[PDB]
From a paper:
The packaging of cargo transmembrane proteins into COPII-coated vesicles entails a direct interaction between COPII protein and cytoplasmically-oriented ER export signals. About a half dozen export signals have been identified to date, almost all comprising short peptide motifs, all of them binding to the Sec24 subunit of the COPII inner coat. The ΦC export signal was identified in studies of p24-family and ERGIC-53 proteins, and comprises a C-terminal signature of a pair of hydrophobic residues or a single terminal valine residue. The ΦC motif contacts a site on Sec24a that is also the binding site for the LxxLE- and DxE-class export motifs.
A series of ΦC-signal peptides was synthesized, based on a core sequence of yeast Emp24p, and individual peptides were soaked at high concentrations into two crystal forms of human COPII protein: one comprising Sec23a/Sec24a•Sec22b, the other Sec24c. For all ΦC sequences, we observed clear evidence for peptide binding to a site on Sec24a in the Sec23a/Sec24a•Sec22b crystals, based on the presence of residual electron density that matches the peptide sequence (this binding site is occluded in the Sec24c crystals). The finding that multiple classes of export motifs bind to a common site is surprising, but the COPII•ΦC crystal structures highlight that the common molecular feature is carboxylate-group recognition by the clustered arginine residues of the B site—the terminal carboxylate group of the ΦC motif adopts a similar position and bonding arrangement to the carboxylate of the glutamate side chains of LxxLE and DxE motifs. Thus, specific recognition of the ΦC motif involves the terminal carboxylate group bonding to Arg750 and Arg752 of Sec24a, with the penultimate hydrophobic residue of the motif nestling against Tyr496, and the terminal hydrophobic residue fitting to a pocket of hydrophobic side chains.
Residue numbers in the entry:
A (entry chain B): 346 to 464, 476 to 662, 666 to 882, 888 to 1093
B (entry chain C): 1 to 23, 29 to 130, 148 to 157
C (entry chain A): 3 to 205, 225 to 464, 475 to 537, 541 to 723, 746 to 764
Write the structure that this text describes.
Amino acid sequence: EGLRVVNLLQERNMLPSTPLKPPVPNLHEDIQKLNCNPELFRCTLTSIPQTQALLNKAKLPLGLLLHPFKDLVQLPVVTSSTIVRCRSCRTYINPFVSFLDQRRWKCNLCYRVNDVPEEEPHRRPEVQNATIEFMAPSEYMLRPPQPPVYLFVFDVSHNAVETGYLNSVCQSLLDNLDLLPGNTRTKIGFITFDSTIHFYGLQESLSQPQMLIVSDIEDVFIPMPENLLVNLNESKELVQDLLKTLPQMFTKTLETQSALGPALQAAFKLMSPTGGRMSVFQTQLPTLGVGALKPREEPNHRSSAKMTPSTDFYKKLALDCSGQQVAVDLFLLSGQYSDLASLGCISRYSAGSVYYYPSYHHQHNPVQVQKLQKELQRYLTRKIGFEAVMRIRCTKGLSIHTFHGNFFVRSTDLLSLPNVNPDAGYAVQMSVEESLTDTQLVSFQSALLYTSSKGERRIRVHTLCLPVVSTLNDVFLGADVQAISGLLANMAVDRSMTASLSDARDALVNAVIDSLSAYRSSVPGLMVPFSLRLFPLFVLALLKQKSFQTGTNARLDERIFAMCQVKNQPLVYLMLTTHPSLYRVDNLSDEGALNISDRTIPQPPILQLSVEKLSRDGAFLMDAGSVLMLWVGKNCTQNFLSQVLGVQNYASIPQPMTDLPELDTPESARIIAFISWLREQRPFFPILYVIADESPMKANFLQNMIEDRTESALSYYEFLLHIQQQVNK
Amino acid sequence: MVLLTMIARVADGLPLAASMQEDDLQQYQSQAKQLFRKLNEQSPTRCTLEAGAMTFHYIIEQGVCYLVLCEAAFPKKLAFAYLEDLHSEFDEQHGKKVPTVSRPYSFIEFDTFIQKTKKLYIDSRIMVANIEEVL
Amino acid sequence: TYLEFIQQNEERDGVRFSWNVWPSSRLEATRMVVPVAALFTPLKERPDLPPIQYEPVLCSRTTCRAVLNPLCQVDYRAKLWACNFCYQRNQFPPSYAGISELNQPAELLPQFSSIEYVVLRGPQMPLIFLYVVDTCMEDEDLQALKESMQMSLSLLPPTALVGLITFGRMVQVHELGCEGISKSYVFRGTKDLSAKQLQEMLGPSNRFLQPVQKIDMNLTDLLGELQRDPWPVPQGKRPLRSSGVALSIAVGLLECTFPNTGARIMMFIGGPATQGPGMVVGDELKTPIRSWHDIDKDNAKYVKKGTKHFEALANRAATTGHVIDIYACALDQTGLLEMKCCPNLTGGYMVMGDSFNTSLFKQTFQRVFTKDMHGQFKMGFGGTLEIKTSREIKISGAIGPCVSLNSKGPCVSENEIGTGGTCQWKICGLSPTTTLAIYFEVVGRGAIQFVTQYQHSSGQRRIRVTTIARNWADAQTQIQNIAASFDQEAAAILMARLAIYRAETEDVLRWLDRQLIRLCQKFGEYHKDDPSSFRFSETFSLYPQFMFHLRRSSFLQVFNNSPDESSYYRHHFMRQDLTQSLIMIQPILYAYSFSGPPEPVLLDSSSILADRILLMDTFFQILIYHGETIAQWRKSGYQDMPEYENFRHLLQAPVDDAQEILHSRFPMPRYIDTEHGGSQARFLLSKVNDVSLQVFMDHLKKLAVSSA
Ligand SMILES: [Zn+2]
């Protein structure tokens, strides 16, 4: 542990060999054992500053990062006939209240005393679990629970037909039709579009589906009152037939324009009466009708930081979908510029999310083909909640002032979530509106009201409790370096859209400068507290990431999609992306976790992201969260080539290698176990490709060695040198 | 001559099954839940209420209330024939589980039969009071 | 015999003039009570004339260019001929260099005065059939209609192109044969579209119009799977039916794909248009469809705006050269009054029944596709009529299924009648019974040449040429020769065509009577102010009777009929030959009794005997009436007894005679079996009998012998 002080100039090896654990709030033993899991709910400062003045002096951002709908191992479900809430601020009774009269409880957020209803009260499950799910009563619904409604909207233009994406998507829908969340009330629908809009009717009385073409692009309408959204249970056979015919109907298409705007307007009209989830697959710039977007020239390594949408059509449309409980998920499989900076608004403000597959092609791009396959598997089978809202409460004195993530902020800070999905993350920024001189603990409560895929109104509640400190040092001792990096990234993305990429990159650098300068003016080299010894490293990693990098050759839609991930992803996968984990894997052995039964999993140490840590003699696995890259050195041992890769020499390693073979060797068993254990830590199955040789030109592997200098960015050492010059200026 | 169907347990007004399609709903859905609250063991078991351009119809069987709303011009004869079709089906399927449930809409899946039955009445091919009184 | 002359000239030339001897002076031309006019049947069938396969041969005076004909003076020595219209002398074309006296071309023999040429120079275009189907109707009616359309698909030529348009609330244009999916383009029936717009929204054959031999199996299965308009019909409402937009899309589709070629737009409606442009009535069931009484008291807010929409469509189709048929079967009115211009301007059919699920409609619909002795349809497309006259004759206009090409020349008269101001007309669709009325004006031997270019059902381009000539009246006896040439039947129909045309484009009876009284004074015989002295010759004696029945007919007394029934009767009367036209004006009546074979009897109450069977042919209706005695004898059961096989011959004698005419007639007449006291005997009682003919004649004689 330690309250020690570190000189970043003399260490340079501060990154530990074992995974980073989130800090433990400085709380009494019995309080901390009840606290919310940090994977679900965590704060940038585990010790809340008592006043806004103290928060300002530390020059660190105060905020929460939440993963509210995350898949859980075990979830207590109270079905109580009554839900116990505070009569003033409607806070749910939670483990951190104060029982006094044993029939009266004091709210930990508004301090009002309440009456425990005749319904050992501190033994009740609502007071033993920081995370709990309630059944909602009749008053908590505006309407009967909506059924699950899935509408798939496919681009079928000539460019789309060429990518061949339709074949895999229709195959995944076929394989996963019985796994779609829902009961017998589930409805499914299909729309394709090119210059016109194509609905599909499904009837057991008709020999085949029927394609209904709306050609009036300026005045779309629903051509049929029934059978466009059909009951999946009743019409399973008709849906399966359609999915087999769709990839073959447009082989010889000469349509080259795409009317994405009008298609979404018709898709909205079709979903308006029920709500649900709308999956949109688009492969090019929208060029026809409302929502047309102008072409643009991609930047190169030479242009400086000189982002925002080009129209508000998709934001307005997304706002209308939010009002009807419709969420739009965007799958952009484009080979050229598509103005994602404007298309992304359809998902940001409707609580959807965007998935990007640059230069998808069924024959030319095997990596993107397998990536879409695996991401669609998760998309179609994960749990889902409909027509949802979220409220976030904190103790009197603390005020949320900025929200980050995919939703719509209604009045009085109701977060509107047409869909809630278990892979979405959110962030919130707060300030101390009133001095916390009164209390010594503060609490945070998020509550998610949603409709399950079974038709049951449920409320998921998480409650977090933290202590209040009154000195600069205690603020620094509780700092969570990763959560600070996450919130800063969300803030820099907003700064980019609001100002420029230069301003966002400056404010990121100045966050390190001002914080360490504040620390220095309150104690030669660059002295940081132990809890911030990775702060310049992660911030430098932020500045070389695809969201904020400068002198690189990055294309517009790449940068936008990297920002959309910052806004939407949970903290963990933002850390795995910004600062991938680097292990040596040609020499695994038996210091592992041999604990999980018959498996022995090696546990190689984490290396720092420098080419100095590589070796032409070995092999190195890089865990980047969504993908795993296995780099083989040119001078790699013959044991690793034959016993792990299945190849007699470096030259016969196939160019795209989409995975490792499973050979009958112990070295093979070790690396397969280590890789197995890595992807079991997550639901989004990450693809491994071993192709990163030194010659396949796929070694963007090196774009992640964030400690090394490049022609357009500093090294980690240069960075520390620049911080120090600014700190004691 | 359109729609709003709700099936509720008379005692506490617990909703059991409903079905509504728009493409307002908020005012008449409230009035419906008012009715369920007021109705008790002394209430008329077959009734029609007048809400201006709209008209409520309901029957009460085995402590369960079957309510429908439509424009005042919709044939009152058909509104009650539609409720009997639902009651016989619903009582046959869940009539004995009704008095035990405690969640709202514990029978959402009765949605399906409601709408296949509903379409056999909104296609041409007892007491009377003013709802504002009862409320 | 003047009768043999009239009869033989209709058989050979398919024409019948009101006067066969024409006024030779300006003083008689202006003073003609009934105008010189011709009932002309451009495609009349006859005993197998040889179709002549060569270019016709024409007068070379650019203004003239008449066709070589038997009235032309030829010189087989000098290889010359003299145009009988402009006196221009012409050299014989190379392929005629070998013609001789013994052997001469067909067009010069008087036998071939009406003759047909086949012009084979370009590839032939396929026929085009576009079905436009309503889906807002009962299941039994829609099922019957689907089977009728499938049956007609198996009679079309292999090379013809077919399309399908269905409608209700929306309009669907089906793209045939797509395989694995059936697709169509959907449009709101709430707003209209132009051909240009429609062409851009949709993108020899098309994707929407495909050859039968490639598409027929898919079309049969599509037509078999057609279902009711999926939109529900609320209580007390009519279904939303967008007939006007569906028709404007069918027209627009063909207009931007195959303009200026033969095409048939066959529309099947099962009710009135209740939405869009062309609307006929609102969707409230409580509001009845308009009646003539509603029309006259200005309680029909849809007639004029709806009529305007379909007239625009009719002219669009007729300009393009396409044909619109309206097949309308329903228990209520359907909007024929507003849509009549589409099959009237074009040569389109108009069929009207109570349901598509009757023998009446099913048999009528298949007569449409009657073939000749070569397996080829008895229809023609893109007909162009051009009339050339002597310098003394001018054309006032035409009345019939035709549109003007607005071509000017010295033959065009200033006094225009009907579709006038032209010597060229277009007739998008014609059959062997299509009869035009051409009205002439004089400003021996006058001559007129009828030239009809049209596309045969086989694809061949054809020219039919009829050339007739009538004597100029000898100046010594101008009115005596003229009065001997009067065709009273032809003139009655020709004057009747003039009266219906003025009523349907608004008192008309006052014009009919002044002309009748005037015809009495000029050509009758009488002492002044002695009504009993009036007599007509055999040449004029039936004209008053034809005029009595015409002025009481449902062609002119529109009340007691629905507006759609008035337009249906008038539709078929403006197209028919003379024989059928007379039957419409004056139904023919046959008597059946033990006392002698079947005999014609007067259309008077005095022919209704109690022991007699009457069979009345109304053209529209075949009616059998069993008198009171025969009704009882037949209510008794005497027919079954072997004793009374004579009472069976009697009861089945009119039934047998009905079956024969109940086939030949294209609009299959409704068949009625009734008796004394029966409800349907009303039809016999209203056609029978001012109050009567005797009173009508006496009043006419009083005015004939009095002031001019
Ligand atoms: Zn409270």
